[PDB]
Amino acid sequence: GVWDPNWDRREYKAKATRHIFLIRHSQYHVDGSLEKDRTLTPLGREQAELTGLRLASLGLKFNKIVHSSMTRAIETTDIISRHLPGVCKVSTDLLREGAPIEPDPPVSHWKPEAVQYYEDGARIEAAFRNYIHRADARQEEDSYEIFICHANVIRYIVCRALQFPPEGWLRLSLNNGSITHLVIRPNGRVALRTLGDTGFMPPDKITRS
Amino acid sequence: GVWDPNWDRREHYKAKATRHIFLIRHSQYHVDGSLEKDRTLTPLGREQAELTGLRLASLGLKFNKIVHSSMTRAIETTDIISRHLPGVCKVSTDLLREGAPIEPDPPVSHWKPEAVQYYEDGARIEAAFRNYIHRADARQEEDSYEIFICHANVIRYIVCRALQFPPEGWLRLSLNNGSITHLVIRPNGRVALRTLGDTGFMPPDKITRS
Amino acid sequence: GVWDPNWDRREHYKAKATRHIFLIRHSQYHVDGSLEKDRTLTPLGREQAELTGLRLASLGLKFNKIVHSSMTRAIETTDIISRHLPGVCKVSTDLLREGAPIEPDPPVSHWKPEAVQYYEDGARIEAAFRNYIHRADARQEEDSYEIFICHANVIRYIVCRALQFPPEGWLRLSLNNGSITHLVIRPNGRVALRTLGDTGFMPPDKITRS
Amino acid sequence: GVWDPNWDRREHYKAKATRHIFLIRHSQYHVDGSLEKDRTLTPLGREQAELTGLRLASLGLKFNKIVHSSMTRAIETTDIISRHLPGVCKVSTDLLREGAPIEPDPPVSHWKPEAVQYYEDGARIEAAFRNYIHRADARQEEDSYEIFICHANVIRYIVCRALQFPPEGWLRLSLNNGSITHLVIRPNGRVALRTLGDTGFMPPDKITRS
Amino acid sequence: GVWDPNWDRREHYKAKATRHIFLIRHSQYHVDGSLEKDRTLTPLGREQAELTGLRLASLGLKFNKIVHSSMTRAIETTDIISRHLPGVCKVSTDLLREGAPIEPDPPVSHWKPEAVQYYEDGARIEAAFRNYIHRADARQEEDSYEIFICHANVIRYIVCRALQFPPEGWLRLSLNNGSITHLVIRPNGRVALRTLGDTGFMPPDKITRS
Amino acid sequence: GVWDPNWDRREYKAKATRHIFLIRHSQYHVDGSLEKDRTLTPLGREQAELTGLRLASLGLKFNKIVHSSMTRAIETTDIISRHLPGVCKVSTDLLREGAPIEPDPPVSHWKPEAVQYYEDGARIEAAFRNYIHRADARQEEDSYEIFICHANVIRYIVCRALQFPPEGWLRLSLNNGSITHLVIRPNGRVALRTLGDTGFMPPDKITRS
Amino acid sequence: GVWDPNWDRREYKAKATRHIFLIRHSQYHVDGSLEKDRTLTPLGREQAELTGLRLASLGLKFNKIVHSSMTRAIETTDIISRHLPGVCKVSTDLLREGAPIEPDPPVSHWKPEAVQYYEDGARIEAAFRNYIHRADARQEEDSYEIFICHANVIRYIVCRALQFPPEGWLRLSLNNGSITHLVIRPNGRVALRTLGDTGFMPPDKITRS
Amino acid sequence: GVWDPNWDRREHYKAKATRHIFLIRHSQYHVDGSLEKDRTLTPLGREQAELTGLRLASLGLKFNKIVHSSMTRAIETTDIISRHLPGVCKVSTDLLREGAPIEPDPPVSHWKPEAVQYYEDGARIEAAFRNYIHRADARQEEDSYEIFICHANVIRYIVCRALQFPPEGWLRLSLNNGSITHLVIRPNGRVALRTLGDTGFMPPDKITRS
Amino acid sequence: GVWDPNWDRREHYKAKATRHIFLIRHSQYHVDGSLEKDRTLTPLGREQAELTGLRLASLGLKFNKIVHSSMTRAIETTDIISRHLPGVCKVSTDLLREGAPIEPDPPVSHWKPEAVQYYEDGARIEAAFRNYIHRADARQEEDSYEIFICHANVIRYIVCRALQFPPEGWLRLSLNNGSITHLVIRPNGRVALRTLGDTGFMPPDKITRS
């Protein structure tokens, strides 16, 4: 039940804090037939633009923008990339949407089958481990890193990062284009500083699908 | 100890199709290369991929896709093998990049990565295994022939996991550069390894492991 | 689960030599043949052994011996492979005749021999494994290259036992006719499988498994 | 402790035939002989095999086959015993060569081979036991009388295994040179030892154990 | 499972002497005989004891004593064997009379005595075993050669107990009429069976088991 | 702890009672060098004569006289046999003297070694089983049987017959020439009716060695 | 299960052995209406006379004759007292006949009820303790003591003295007028030297009721 | 803790009769007396027994028996009490002689007998309790009035046992010389103590406890 | 089971004095009397108290106090007993009134008060016990002789508690009318009952229990 301080790589000793900005994609055409048809809507593009504008206004030197290989995630990265010029980009399969694990409590509308929790769960857990950890000892400066992916992924990441039961990932909810801020101090401590932040979007332009 | 027949998704309709999977190690490459993009194939490397490509074309098979690691050596061998198999879908993947799958038994002196690597990479390679090695989808009508161009530790760990052998013994296998490794996955969920580290098609003077 | 390093004879002095072992399945043969002596190679069979022989000659290796099964199909492939490797000691063996090593897991419908076969043949194939697969004698100065021309179940059981994988999974492997399978046994007792069921040297139209 | 009645192949129909098995130790031989081919019978040795042969001929039995070890001393006694039993099939075997079957209990000072021998030879002698000692095939109509000309440790281990006594006690038995040992295997699977180390037919001045 | 070295009286001074024990089954006898004294040897019986006697005399051994069962068939064979070994102490015993030592495994249909017999006779035969089969007394200077003329079940149970094999398997052995069985008991407590059911000295036409 | 009614062969069903008369030998020359030197003394012969005379005076038709093969036991059987003419005799090794089992409580003067308890114990126990049991079902008449042997043997027989701890065999004591009477009813029940009886010997002629 | 060496009063230290002679009464009129009618028969008196004669012939200086207060026990003491003149006599209630404890194995003819085992058992056990023990430390000479009582009493005494299961008291049997000899060495060790001895009675004059 | 109603013989017919039991301690006596027969009553003693006797006669009861201890002081008081109750059966007993019933709690300094006494005497006094204190026999028609003339420890132990109080507390009671103690035993098995250590009938100048 | 030596106040200095306590039941009284004041002594009652009084005067003891129950029958007997003991302090008490102390074991049919009485009266009688029955105060130099004139259940419960017997057995005792009961309490805390229900001083025709 207690916090594990070696949830990755515990004590050179690390000096740097990593700020992690987990961003859900914007609105997209769900009905789209093939993956490449599932592109952002006109509203979607407006949302990513605001999200991009907000990150630019923070006055931070972002190191990289890592993103899911799904078309909706790429298209929001395309728009957010404009407001943050000359920032390294990296495509990832690990951050594609999936079914992380059986959510508790259960739900009627959404019950994927055991094979999905098996295949996707190992992938999302692998994403968590590779992207959420304390700094390398060889990192001199504090990093600010953007991760543009999907709802289940982010919510599972957040629960795992905080060492809450991962089963409760579906007790969280994230709007489209929403910024979620995790801090990872070099002693291994994690703090969630905002979740599902879309205070920067005019209320008429906030959605979850 | 016993074979698990629901190692993924056992009998919704039932699968009809067999998947042939061709796990191909990359060719020789400049290890000393400074950045990842400098770690390109050698002149010998290119010769090896050419032979591997030539061999796959000679099989008389209609390959559906070529999936490959995002590492530069894997891409460059895919570039050459792609020429002999024209008009075949290609897909880049991070999952299949080289890593340290898990603690190998018995241990070795030259190569001992630290626990964090087995943690981070192991979950990634295991995720790769699960997403690419399984029996057919029920909605697949025809038998597939699929190429996977990646790296040694990855392939050897895939093979051990596919066969349900202890994954710890992945380093008891060894694979030459440009080598074809054939797994069959019948729709009943059964796996058979049909050849491993095959480079019989390379002239002996052109066979390497680094 | 763990690797046993004294699976035979662990550190008279200490061994210096690596043994390369080349387990070769026989070529195509007339299965319908009435008596054992009728079960001879086919025209295709002879073509396969010729290629296998040609490939071994092209390796530029000084083979020490060719040990073979006493079954007619194994002898006949040894006859052809022996031509390309002139002046190499040959030795006939009963231990390496085909059999049913042990109950395979998972089971199969087409092939179910009865308990007495697993008992009689299993002890024979296990005896073959122990007598031929081990690390070098201490009195051997130079690295050996040894050919073993026998049969599918035998080889697959040898391979599983050599690698210390569950022997029950011998039928999860599959070996083509005339196929070269390479095991290395370093003098520290470590075993590595370097290729399995290699027939990259055969034109695709001439590859079979029966 | 209890007798296993399916120690091989228990109730294609059911067996009708009893197999009489005559395990014969070789005669005296030159132990000091440098190579295996030098280890030939002595003048006394030949006298012993002659008596053993004479005795088997006097039994009035139609022997089906004489199976023998491939060691020179075993062959040479088979050569002499073969004369008195004319027109009886002969078969050479590696399985029946002398070895160290398993760690004997209690231990002995004079004779302590090392673990690798018990491993390699034990599997071979056990394989010999299983392949030659079992109840009749169902397709055998008449009772067989079979001769097996081999070596002391082999026979004593066979006998202990046949009777289902602890095989560790093989060295608690002792067999003279040229000695006949009679096992019966009724078709119900029951084994009876009817004489062991019989050399009552040799004049006392011509009995040896080395 | 392991050999007990203090199965009697292990290292008072220490034993120096080996005891050779010659367990001899009686010859053929009239089973149908009404009273015990009617159960005398047949004409063949007498011929058998004569040969057995002749054989023991030909060994060139100075026998110390002849101990025998008090049953008439055992006495009558002792009478004939005593002639060829003149001036050798004789001693009658009840302990060595025939009985049912213990439940034999596996069971038999023809012969099933009831629990009271295994109780009464078993304690008697076990007492016989202990009193006659042990290592030498320390006060015995010379190696002994001792004859024990008794019955089949007795001998077979003695042999199993002497060798520390499961006594239940006494009926897995079988002994001819007039047959010599040789046990050696070295002064360190070690037992070796050197021949069992030896009747090689009888012409085949004169060998029986009842 | 409770009486076992199948201490041999329990329920044709038996009809006959067996009376068993366990008789210790008379005085003998203990110092005698070889077994054949250990013969009865002049007093010994007097004792056996009285014992014999007493058994003849009982007016019983004795079926057999079984005896130990030791010289002192034979010699007393020779004298007792005279007073009971035409009664079957049988020699036995089972009834020779020995050390039946470790006696409790222990004693200082007499401590034989483990090998004796092993070899002799199995023999005396075998004697007990073969001679002490209920009648055969095929026995029509009540038997009266004499057993001429030795002290340790008899005392061990008695303890075993009564189902008392056999360890207490040395808590009993038996005079030379002494009659000991066991009854074995056909239902398997045993009764000791006299032990170490030498009331028939003049007091000046009673010994235990 | 093992012998208890402090079955009474274990280690001045005792020097003396006590010989104890437990004697059953002679034949008596069982049918007698009142206790005083249950007197010895003409045969009874003959038996006590022989028993008395035998004890006198032992050449022992008896210290006391203790006896049961039942009329048959007194009457045999009267006759035995004649042959041992000037020997202290003592009457006792403790040694009257009773049912000591449930006998094993059971019997059909004789099954007294629980109250008897309760009342009599405590009395016979009290008799055992008061009369059967090792010598007092203050006793210089070896004693020879006579106890004239009844069958169940004696048989229970004997079983308890020897430390055998007392339940087996009915596995013993004692003739009328029979001498039973217990020895109690000063180290606390007990030996039974004869039981139910009537070798001194002509066979035609031996009874058990 | 609870009253046991079958402390002897509970409901064969059922008891109808109540037993009154009058436990009387002896009078004063010469303790210093050398032998038991010297320990006779004093002149005061005789006066006490006379009063006790006089009191029992004045009760107007038909006493059935007077049972008494065999000690001389108990007999001598019975002699005097017997005069006032003419023609009443008398019976001597060893059971009721004085002793040490069991370890008294709490302990005392002046009087500590040793374990052997509690063993020997305790079983005797307990036997006395059981034989004399119980409910009526069914065959007793009339209510009995019974006198028991004995000693202090005996009576006090009887009383504690009769009432089912801890017998260890027997020394918490105290009884004067010549004192009457009355127990009633109704035929349902119930016990009542009606007076204890009653000497109200003695002039105070004539009351003692030794 | 064991005696508690600190049943009150165990070793201000240490106690020197013994307390004699004389628990006296009231005399006969009119039970049928309507109100408590009607329940006065009978003519016989007065005769009884007179004798009890006369007896206490004859003891030659200097009584310190007479404590009594406030019930009319207890007062009236105190009135008569007070005459024979002139100038002795008197004290009335509610604690010593009659009640139901606790459930008696064994139970009775005639008398079954209900749980509330055992609750209310039990606490009162127990309080009486504690306040009046204990060892002397340390400040008391001389031995006391104290009279307590009360009722049957009270006294019997006091006695059981004083002796540390199960209080449940209070009804196993019985006390006559006018009866003296003597408890001694030595300064070490030890209690002895020296007589109970003593009415030896009353002519038999004048003894009652109601």
Residue numbers in the entry:
A (entry chain C), F (entry chain C), G (entry chain C): 56 to 66, 92 to 289
B (entry chain B), C (entry chain A), D (entry chain A), E (entry chain B), H (entry chain B), I (entry chain A): 56 to 66, 91 to 289
Manuscript text:
Phosphoglycerate mutase family member 5 (PGAM5) is a mitochondrial membrane protein that belongs to the phosphoglycerate mutase (PGAM) branch of the histidine acid phosphatase superfamily, known also as two-histidine phosphatase (2H-phosphatase). Despite harboring a canonical RHGE catalytic motif, PGAM5 lacks a typical phosphotransferase and/or phosphohydrolase activity for small metabolites, and displays instead a phosphatase function specific for Ser/Thr and, potentially, histidine residues (Takeda et al., 2009, Panda et al., 2016).
To provide structural insights into the role of the N terminus, we next determined the structure of the longer ΔN54-PGAM5 in complex with a phosphate ion. In all three molecules in the asymmetric unit, although most parts of the N-terminal extension to the catalytic domain (amino acids 67–90) was disordered, clear electron density allowed a confident assignment of the WDPNWD motif within the N-terminal region, which packed along the surface of the catalytic core. Within the asymmetric unit, one subunit of the dimer associated with the subunit of an adjacent dimer with their α3 helices paired in a reverse manner at the dimer-dimer interface. The WDPNWD-containing N terminus was then positioned in proximity to the proline-rich β3-α3 catalytic loop, leading to an alternated arrangement that resulted in the β3-α3 catalytic loop of one molecule being sandwiched between two neighboring N termini, one from the subunit within the dimer and the other from the protomer of the adjacent dimer. This configuration promoted most likely an ordering of the loop that in turn completed the active site architecture, a feature not observed in the ΔN90-PGAM5 structure. Based on the dimer-dimer arrangement, an application of the crystallographic symmetry led to a single-layer, doughnut-like dodecameric assembly with an outer dimension of 138 × 48 Å and a radius of 65 Å for the inner hole.
